[PDB]
Amino acid sequence: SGAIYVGNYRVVNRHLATHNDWANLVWEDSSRDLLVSSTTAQGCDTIARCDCQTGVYYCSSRRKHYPVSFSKPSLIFVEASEYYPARYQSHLMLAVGHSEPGDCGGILRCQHGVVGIVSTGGNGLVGFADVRDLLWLDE
């Protein structure tokens, strides 16, 4: 679990979005595993606008943060789960690191701000849904 809170927006994994997220929907994209909903309170986070390929992510199944080197956002095949059919997920960045399904929502940060959220993984890999291209999150 986990979310990004920026301005009057809440960014979550689309497959973990709640009934309240869908009732206050701003934008969603199944191919990215992202959903953004509106909030009444001002958020705590800020978004990176950069090309960093290193950063630190929070891993809830270890209660720890780990440093990672990750690939640039790209189209990556993701196997079927109870949430999606087997498909290509876009804007995904892969790294070597521990992750389990419940780790989705953990934030990846670089020195500039939030980069994305945990969305995929297994077998010593962890994948992050990028949010740096969503410029409207800041307006």
Ligand SMILES: COc1cccnc1CN1CCC[C@H](C(N)=O)C1
């Ligand atoms: C950290 O995520 C892990 C780890 C291990 C195994 N499965 C996942 C996530 N997995 C299941 C939920 C939907 C997700 C997706 N974006 O399609 C894929």
Ligand SMILES: [Zn+2]
């Ligand atoms: Zn950066």
